[PDB]
Amino acid sequence: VEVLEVKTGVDSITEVECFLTPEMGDPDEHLRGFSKSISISDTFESDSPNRDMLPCYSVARIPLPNLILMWEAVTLKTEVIGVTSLMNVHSNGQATHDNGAGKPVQGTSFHFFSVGGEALELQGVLFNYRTKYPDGTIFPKNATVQSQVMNTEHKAYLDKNKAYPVECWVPDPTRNENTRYFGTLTGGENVPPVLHITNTATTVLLDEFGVGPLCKGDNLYLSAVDVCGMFTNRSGYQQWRGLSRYFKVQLRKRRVK
Amino acid sequence: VEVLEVKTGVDSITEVECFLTPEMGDPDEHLRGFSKSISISDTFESDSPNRDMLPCYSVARIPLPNLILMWEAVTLKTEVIGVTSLMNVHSNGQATHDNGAGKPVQGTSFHFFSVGGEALELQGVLFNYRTKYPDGTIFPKNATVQSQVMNTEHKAYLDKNKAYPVECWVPDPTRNENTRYFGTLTGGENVPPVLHITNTATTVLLDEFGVGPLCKGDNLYLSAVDVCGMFTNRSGYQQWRGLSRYFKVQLRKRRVK
Amino acid sequence: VEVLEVKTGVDSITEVECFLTPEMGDPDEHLRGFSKSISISDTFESDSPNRDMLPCYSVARIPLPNLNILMWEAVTLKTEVIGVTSLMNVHSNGQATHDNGAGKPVQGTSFHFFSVGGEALELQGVLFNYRTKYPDGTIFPKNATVQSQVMNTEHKAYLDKNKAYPVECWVPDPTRNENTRYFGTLTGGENVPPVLHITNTATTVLLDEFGVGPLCKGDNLYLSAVDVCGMFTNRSGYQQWRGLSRYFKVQLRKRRVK
Amino acid sequence: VEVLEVKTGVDSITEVECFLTPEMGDPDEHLRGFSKSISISDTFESDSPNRDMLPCYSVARIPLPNLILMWEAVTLKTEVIGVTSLMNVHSNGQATHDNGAGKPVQGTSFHFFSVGGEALELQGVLFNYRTKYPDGTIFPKNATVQSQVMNTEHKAYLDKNKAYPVECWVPDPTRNENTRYFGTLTGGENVPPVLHITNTATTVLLDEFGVGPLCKGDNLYLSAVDVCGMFTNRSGYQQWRGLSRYFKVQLRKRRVK
Amino acid sequence: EVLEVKTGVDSITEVECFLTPEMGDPDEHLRGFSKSISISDTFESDSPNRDMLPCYSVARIPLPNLILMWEAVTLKTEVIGVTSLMNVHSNGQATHDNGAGKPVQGTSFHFFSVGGEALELQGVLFNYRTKYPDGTIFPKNATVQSQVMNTEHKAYLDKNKAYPVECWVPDPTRNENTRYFGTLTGGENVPPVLHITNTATTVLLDEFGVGPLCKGDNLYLSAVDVCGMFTNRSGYQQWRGLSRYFKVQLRKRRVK
Incomplete structure (x- = not known):
């Protein structure tokens, strides 16, 4: 694909605005946004996580106005929605000490977003290649011990919700030329969430050539993971807690040959 | 609104200067700036926080000189007032160890301000959709399990003081075009407050087009939350502690069509 | 004050260099730089801290060469905390971190603050607890009410005396101080580690958005500081604030005003 | 060699893309990417770590198109592969408290990469000069007590994979004129991994004279260490855990005398 | 008076070297370590042994014989041997049952100067009643005012293994002809954070474009790199230090 000039005129720009809800596992009708309580297998060999215990990547395919011209994604505004909810330290939590408030959501987090x-x-990439992934998830197949470091056989597209567990997939750095992705994993059982919100911050999506993601077949792809940490119940059982992510993307028409 | 030229001359500028007091709950006549001690529900179903246990958003609507021209907010200076008061570790606190000083205010904080x-x-956004919020607060109504992640029915205006609880409301990123907001949630029961003060820092409120918030009906809206963390008393009970926030906003007259 | 041109020539510039010592309470003849051990009241209403237990703001009023009305304008500042390495003394009546271990170093809540005006x-x-009874010899908010816990505009003062204004009940007033530049950081928490940077290569410019620095009324420069580095914990677990001196070097130039 | 002009035009640029797998010790057929559990010696004199307990530097030598012209390395994109695998807190782990999830990978980390x-x-440099390093590793020979601080006899080339223990060797700052290297050691038993991923960040490899690494014999050398921390099993035994590193390097032909 | 920079081939030189740490070296096997730290019963009985006190390192480097003076312009520097701190298998105290050894951690001071x-x-003294040991150079005639500021305590870093870190800081009222940088990170659980790269340069020129000017054709390099404490199996703790690399570029400058 050869990239030519940008179109101008009022008609030449468009915006997409939406939110992606988290997919933490939703173990019952009351627990949307949470995983099932986390349990630990006795050995690597016996690791067989329940589907509702595994957070998955979120994805949305957004149809754009029908258009050779392509829509080019230029800027992104994004934020995690509902950061203050984590201030609820009075709901079935475990007191930090005698008479104390509930232990807040904390521990390992993964915050990730992409526009393509x-x-x-x-x-x-698997922590443990012998993990048995549950029916209903899409996971690395034909895993070997090399899957614990790098097995090039494990290639996929984020093309379905509630399907791709976070713990076994990452963005493929060898591909993704037509996507911009950003993530941070903060590990450790006591790490505190640090969540910033503002409507004043824009990320520019253009590459070093001044070209943003070009939308094949007039579709924009948004992906997210926002595992904020773990909620600890009074019993001490812990569940992943996730939040939704807002996206606002500006796009312009670009001619290509 | 179509935006035209800025008015110049001596008459063309104005200043708003004020402070917003925190609304932490004020459980008795000696505890302005604190919440009621936090207690924890037995179950998700039975979460029923009392009003004086819930910090709320602060807001001031500031009338501007009567003025088609509109006042345009251009710059902000802002500061948390009384940061050193958190050095009082000698006032019914809980000793950190035998013979030690009192545990200082620490734990989950939310620092937020907006100019619009x-x-x-x-x-x-609710941590727990089954939380019963108390009389005298304004809270998400007709909550469903989907309210734990994103229920678009829950839209409101920050239009009353000491009413909108911090834990169930965030700035709506899908709206707020005429406001600039900034916030940080730092979670974890042991996080240290880190509070900077200076009279040398200005935030510019102009958007990417060089336009600040335009004051409809000649009112400026200032909003804040400064939950600094929790105070732990001698018996281990914990209360939110908040502080006031200073605002100084420079405004100029802007013609619109 | 209408601010006119800057004077030039050899006679037109001057320097102020000094250190401000901390005022932590100094509970005896051997404990300069420390507070008395901290004790805790059993109720808010019985919080009666002793004077030697309360860190205070430090202040220095520095006379400048005597001075149409010309005023000395403060333009740049170099500053740093003096004696940072002293906190490496972990062998001196400290509480061992664990059996056979070294002494716990100074740590916990710090307040690092400096101003030039x-x-x-x-x-x-602003008061943590409005019913705190501050001791004789300190200058403190008077006629305190429960509103003093968040904002009571009656409590206005000038940092005009050393060893007198307790840190915990006073802050720079953001509604005033047009003729001062101030900078402070509170880091709270009992386990917080001191992070103290030193260098002679860093300068802070004191000019405001209009290119004007503090103008020295009556040819006096006012320097203020607090450097509570944390608490020292002794063998028995008693804790005392520990403070350090602060170095100031300020460059000034002559400025005509109308 | 005098460095002259860059060749421009059709086949004057080339690109290298690969991944380096970690060499953490691999103590059995199921444990690629992990070390053997760490044992502690009784005294300094008796320190004798087994080969499979010692992470090693990784290196790959990449042959370039055959070319006086030399390939010049100009830019690097790099990232750690499989960051999300650290969210597996459900297998053979040690609960962080009664009924809690497993302790995530944490503690001392070393992240390092170079292009030359x-x-x-x-x-x-040796922590303890009396450490007996195992057969099959390449380590500082003729160690003396000075080797604990600086013994200039200890020079080597990272010229073999799975051979040079991380704890024995650092990049030599007195050499490496023709390499760019970057590393961070984060110590402490409980330090949280913080791992950022993005395809939008580039490192420029040019020195202050605008010259990048010049590839002798048309070979590019890539080196890495990514010890992410330690995994703790149910019984408290700890093993280093490493992850692969992606490299994409852009190169240009440079004429030299 | 500082005049122009001399140019041409012969007008630049470079200095490269390492400074070894001076942590106390309590025996023939423990270079880079202090003696185990012990704690006095009271302030008035504080009497640290020599081998328990880390000291500043200093090197005076002779430059090519030259009024011209060598001017130090840039610096590249890093801590050498950062990865050695990954030895958690050597007589350390296990973090928990069956765990690896606790790594080096706690209070650090990382400092360097070029002058x-x-x-x-x-x-400046933590405790003015500390009795400092024979063989160290320490603030003399100490009073309670030495705990905050006693202008009597002035010295030159003119000897290796002599000036204890805890007693002395760079004097900010002097050092016009030196550039110095240092960070103290306190707290007993503080993790070392150590960066290495051959791509970072510090410019030594002041606001007037003038670097340190080398009197008598000598360059002075000083360092402290106390990385933290190593805890042994029995809980005893010792300072651990590491060497520091310096590369300095100098140019000939005419002075009056």
Whole structure:
């Protein structure tokens, strides 16, 4: 694909605005946004996580106005929605000490977002290659011990919700030329969430050539993970807690040959 | 609104200077700036926080000189007032160890401020959709399990003091075009307050087009939350502690069509 | 004050260099730089801290060469905390971190603050607990009410005396201080580690958005500081604030005003 | 060699893309990416770590198109592969409290990468000069007590994979004129991993004279260490855990005398 | 008076070297470590042994014989041997049952200076009644005012293994001809955070474009790199230090 000039005129720009809800596992009708309580297998060999215990990547395919011209994604505004909810330290929590408030959501977090002109490309990496992934999830197949470091057989597209567990897939750095992705994993059982909100921050999506993601077949792909940490119940059982992510993307028409 | 030229001359500028007091709950006549001690529900179903246990958003609607021209907010200086009061570790606190000083205010904090030409627009997000919020508060209504992640029915305006609880409302990123907002949630029961003060820092409120918040009906809206963390008393009970926030806003007259 | 041109020539510039010592309470003849051990009241209403237990703001009023009305304008500042390495003494009546271990170093809540102005720093009182009874010899918010816990505009003062204004009840008043530049950081928490940077290569410019620095009324420069580094914990677990001196070097130039 | 002009035009640029797998010790057929559990010696004199307990530097030598012209390395994109695998807190782990999730990978980390026109040059520094290093590793020889601080006899080239223990060797700052290297050691038993991923960040490899690494013999040398921390099993045994590193390097032909 | 920079081939030189740490070296096997730290019963009985006190390191480097003076312009510097702190298998105290050894952690001081003369020091004491040992150079005639500021305590960093870190800091009222940088990170659980790269340069020129000017053709390099404490199996703790690399570029400058 050869990239030519940007179109101008009022008609030449468009915006997409939406939110992606988290997919933390939702273990019952009351627990949307939470995983099932986390349990620990006795050995690597016996690791067989329940589906509702595994957070998944979120994805949305957004149809754009029908258009050779392509929509080019230029800027992104994004934020995590509902950061203050984590101030509820009075709901079935475990007191930090005698008479204390509830232990807040804390521990390992993964905050990730991407904007692309096609589905996010994934590479599988397993903590433990013998983990048995549950029916209903899409996971690295034919895993070997090399899957614990790098097995190039594990290639996928983020093309379905509630399907791709966070713990076994990452953005494939060898691909994704037509996507911009950003993530941070903060590990450790006591790490505190640090969540910033503002409507004043824009990320520019253009590459070093001044070209943003180009939307193949007039579709924009948005992906997210916002595992904020773990909620600890009074019993001490812990569940992942996630929040939704807002996206606002500006796009312009670009001619290509 | 189509935006035209800025008015110049001596008459063309004005200043708003004020402070917003925190609304932490004020459980008795000696505890302005604190919440009621936090207690924890037995279950998710039975979460029923009392009003004096819930910090709320602060808001001031400031009338501007009567003026088609509109006042445009251009710059902000802001500061948390009384940061050193958190050095009082000698006042019914809980000794950190035998013979030690009192445990200082620490734990989950939310520091938030916004400047707008109209009320801050809020989206509701609930940690637990089954929480019964108390009489005298304004809270997400007709909550469903989906309210734990994103229920678009929960839209409100920050239009009343000591009413909108921090934990169930955030700025609505889908709206707020005429407001600039900034916030940080730092979670974890042991996080240290880190509070900077200076009279040398200015925030510019202009958007990417060089336009600040435009004050409809000649009112400026200022909003804040400064939950600094929790105070732990001698018996281990914990209360939110908040502080006031200073605002100084420079405004100029702007013609609109 | 209408601010006119800057004077030039050899005679037109001057320097102020000094250190301000901390005022932590100094409970005896051997404990300069420390507070008395901290004790805790059993109720808010019985919080009666002793004077030697309360860190205070430090202030220095520095006479400048005597001076159409010309005023000395403060333009740049170099500053740093003096004696940072002293906190490496972990062998001196400290509480061992664990069996056979070294002494716990100074740590916990810090307040690091400095200001340069052409008049006394202006203060606003805010109280953690309005019923705290501050001791004789300190200058404290008077006629305190429960509103003093968040904002009571009656509590206005000038930082105009050393060893007198307790840190915990006063802050720079953001509604005033047009003729001062101030900078402070509170880091709270009992386990917080001191992070103290030193260098002779860092300068802070004191000019405001209009290119004007503090103008020294009556040819006096006002320097203020607090450097509570944390608490020292002794063998028995008693804790005392520990403070350090602060170095100031300020460059000034002559400025005509109308 | 005098460095002359860059060649421009059709085949004057080339690109190298690969991943380096971690060499953490791999104590059995199921544990690629992990070390053997760490044992502690009784005294300094008796320190004798087994080969499979010692992470090693990784290196790859990449042949470039055959070319006086030399390939010049100009830019690097790099990232750690499989960051999300650290969210597996459900297998063979040690609960962080009664009924809690498993303790995530945490503690001492070393993240390091280099790009050069020849092998990374190493200087040996030993924590304990009396450590008996195992057969099959390449370590500072003829160690003396000075080796604990600086013994200039300890020079090596990172010229073999799975051979040079991380704890024995650092990049030699007195050499490496023709390499760019970057590393961070984060110590402490409880430090949280903080791992950022993005395809939008580039490192420029040019020195202050605008010259990048020049590839002798048309070979590019890539080196890495990514010890992310330690995994703790149910019984408290701890093992280093490493992850692969992606490299994409852009190169240009440079004329030299 | 500082005049113009000399140019041409012969007008630049570079200095490269390492400074070894001076942590106390309590025996023939423990270079880079202090003696185990012990704690006095009271302030008035504080009497640290020599081998328990880390000291400032200093090197005076002779430059090519040259009024011209060598001017130090840039610096590249890093801590050498950062990865050695990954030895958690050597007589350490297990973090928990069956765990690895606790790594080096706790209070650190990382400091370096480049000057055209000895670094000037000001003394400040944690406890003025500390009895400092024979073989160290320490603030003399100490009073309670030495705990905050006693201008009597002035010295030059003119000897290795002599000036204890805890007694002395760079004197900010002097050092016109030196550039110095240091960070104290306190607290007993503080994790070392150590960066290495050959791509970072510090410019030594002041606001007037003038770097340290080397009196008598000597360059002065000083360092402290106390990385933290190593805890042994029995809980005893010792300071651990590491060497520091310096690369300095100098140019000939005419002075009056």
